[PDB]
């Protein structure tokens with residue numbers, strides 16, 4: 001079940017207009033207050049008019065709209081369930097503009113929602129583009145429009161939230177498909193639940209930024225229910241999805257062919273582990289006591305070339321365990337892993353103790369000291385995020401989290417960890433004065449300019465409950481060592497939420513929930529457009545364009561020559577991300593040292609060390625004098 005952030009508006013003086021309506025199933029039948037009566041389009045008489053089918057509402061007066069509900073027909077018939085749709089808002093009548101919400105709803109009889117940012121409007125319009133099973137009809141039992149307590153205009157210069165992407169599933173896990181630019185998302189065996197799973201099935205969904213289309217696919221070929229996994233993009237360009245509900249399995253997502261192919265079983269059955277891509281393109285994983293048993297689960301490595309998993313039992317999980325009250329079940333979860341030089345993997349936390357993991361032979365571990373500063377020793381920070389914003393200088397920003405997985409207060413603790421060579425204890429200092437808001441279950445992404453966008457979460461970690469939410473996102477700016485509050489959103493993004501950087505420089509933030517008949521399932525996502533895409537007038541700024549590239553595929557140490565349409569000041573390489581349960585071990589940023597060839601022609605070198613420039617797919621962004629980035633050019637980095 002689900003959402004809607006506000007209170008229902010009075011349906012007394014409402015004037016409703018439909019494009020098609022039968023006798024006995026009129027347009028006004030969707031606002032009467034009965035769940036047994038319904039609106040239905042032409043069937044039998046006047047033939048069968050195929051969708052788009054429109055439902056326009058006139059609320060007579062200006063209301064602070066933040067959502068809508070659509071209750072399907074409750075008579076047991078499927079004819080009319082809305083699939084693809086769009087929600088529009090207006091103040092006059094024929095100046096709708098862009099949709100405030102768009103996407104696809106699941107094929108069932110449950111109440112569907114479209115939750116979006118507050119915007120004053122008099123007219124609301126629900127366009128039903130398709131029917132859930134491809135039939136010509138559209139039927140709504142009850143349609144309600146929701147309102148917020150008040151409207152506060154978004155502050156100029158602090159970004160913008162919107163539109164909302166309505167989804168058929170709760171996106172508890174996600175990844176960008178680099179070759180196509182689409183967002184791949186997945187839930188479990190069901191769209192809203194995981195408990196009582198027979199295994200072997202994952203419901204996936206995708207969203208295309210260029211088309212706006214949301215499609216779904218049932219994945220059974222890999223015999224893996226991919227809820228609660230380790231996720232990593234290997235050097236061969238495939239997403240390694242490990243364990244979870246089906247603890248011993250591995251699933252490989254290939255972006256170029258848009259398909260899922262079976263991977264070899266892991267040596268140790270895991271759930272909630274973090275996996276990290278290494279310097280040689282291999283994938284390292286450790287811990288994960290959510291599924292497959294609760295015991296000491298040491299490291300293991302995946303080789304893409306041989307298609308094997310090999311145990312590294314001496315890469316001990318013991319030194320990275322948090323002091324979690326629930327014990328080993330939680331203490332080895334969601335490690336802040338980063339692939340580094342010479343096959344090593346840095347573990348930045350969540351435990352106070354940081355460690356170096358080695359992958360040669362049967363593995364090894366060496367203490368990297370405690371995450372600390374002049375303010376003291378940093379406590380365990382489960383569900384705290386870690387972002388490598390400057391891989392060349394080995395800079396990692398860590399923030400938030402709580403001592404225990406649940407029933408624990410989040411903190412404002414933030415640190416900057418500076419990596420040196422493997423085996424050396426990194427320097428750690430506090431980041432500014434920490435976060436503005438204490439948050440756990442929050443998500444983050446590194447932006448083109450080196451800044452880290454932090455969003456969602458709650459002050460006290462209570463899974464599946466939308467209590468003590470943080471609506472105001474923050475951006476950390478390294479050059480200034482300062483956090484900045486951005487414009488707030490209206491949707492709670494707590495446990496099971498995700499954030500990914502899109503190729504267009506915007507942030508995709510979604511999910512939260514996945515508990516079944518609970519009221520906290522968020523079958524959606526929202527787009528955050530940062531300030532760097534806006535001019536001083538509050539309109540979308542002119543973006544510099546990468547007119548030509550010498551090559552799309554490059555080896556570490558190699559050069560790329562580009563041509564632009566205007567002068568460039570800075571450039572960056574951002575590794576494509578993957579996300580689940582606050583973990584994103586794939587994203588990282590490399591600031592590029594540019595050589596000006598003149599005539600808007602620039603050259604740069606991809607770092608020689610594959611521990612910095614992790615093999616895989618990367619986003620090339622160029623920034624002008626005003627700081628406005630281009631859309632990304634997809635670059636494949638090999639060894």
Ligand SMILES: [Cu+2]
Nearest residue numbers: 172228496581
């Ligand atoms: Cu979970």
Ligand code: NA
Nearest residue numbers: 029034037141
């Ligand atoms: Na009705």
